A = this chain, B = another copy of it.
């Protein structure tokens, strides 16, 4: 019942500036007790149009059961007053419970997908719909986790998960070292980092933007793992490893990071496969980039190496949630060239 009702609302996207300028507990409580059920209900309605053999997997049934229970947990606060202190404190406890309940959503959904794909025939249309759904499902989770964690961290130098002066280069170095450690453990060697930076907006000044560092770290860690693996495997018959070159550029509207390796590249024919849905790190990393209207692209030189590029909005006011909405256009989405 509650699912159908709240699915009629459209999600309300927030800017990073809103999350900053705002971060009153009563206001956050009133907003989130409405907004989180809306987002949960919207994606629940989309789960119901997936193939029947996929929805009936124990994994998708778990996700659906968790999301429905969290929606009901949150809807129960609509009968409470924002002035009710126990309700404010219980709301924090409930968000923590919901976050704990959703801790394993990503690997559980992935398990359902893998089980369905391995067991059943998947026509090309269905395969494209699964890509469409998974992008939207995982973006939806990124967004609910973002909002809930903001309220938890603030009300239970950063404003919640947002660093208003994110040291981009420092995140790049941290993500690279994380990948380096795993590369050394597995291969006994790893490429070095050759980093340069260009502050076009503020010449010679350090590069800072408003951003969620954990998101940026996730994107860079995944790209570095892939670039290090490609370098080591492509150059296994070599004494030394070519470095991974990174340039960080702050323009007027955009913050760009380009990661270059000489790991042999990938044929253009199959480059898109890397973004197909464990092999989920790259498509999810692109979701993180697009979440606040950024983007993540790969362009490879098969036989030589690969360039990975992250785009982020440089202005917090333009960093607005990109949210999926279950509406006529979505349902409809589910030969002019030879």
Q: Does A337 interact with chain B (Cβ within 8 Å)?
A: yes
Q: Are B338 and A302 in contact (CB under 8 A)?
A: no
Which chain A residues in 288-331 approach chain B with CB under 8 Å? 295, 297, 299-304, 307, 309, 311, 321-325, 327-330
A336-B325, A337-B322, A338-B10 as given contacts; A268 in contact with B302, CB under 8 Å: no
Q: Are B324 and A335 in contact (CB under 8 A)?
A: no
Complex contacts, A327 vs chain B, CB 8 Å: 335-336
A85 to chain B, nearest CB (A): 33
Residue of B nearest to A335 (CB): B329
Q: Are B302 and A299 in contact (CB under 8 A)?
A: no
Complex contacts, A337 vs chain B, CB 8 Å: 322-325
A119 to chain B, nearest CB (A): 29
Report copies per complex. Answer: 2
Complex contacts, A269 vs chain B, CB 8 Å: 253
* A52-60, A88-96, A179-187, A243-251 - the one binding chain B: A243-251
Q: Does A75 interact with chain B (Cβ within 8 Å)?
A: no
The size of the chain A interface, using a CB distance under 8 A, is 46
Task: Tell me which of B13, B252, B268, B302 contacts A200 (CB under 8 A).
Answer: B302
Q: Are A299 and B297 in contact (CB under 8 A)?
A: yes
Q: Are A323 and B304 in contact (CB under 8 A)?
A: no
1/0 contact trace for A258-273 toward B, CB 8 Å?
1000001101110000
Q: Are B336 and A330 in contact (CB under 8 A)?
A: yes
Within the assembled complex, what's the spacing in Å between the Cα atoms of A286 and B304? 23
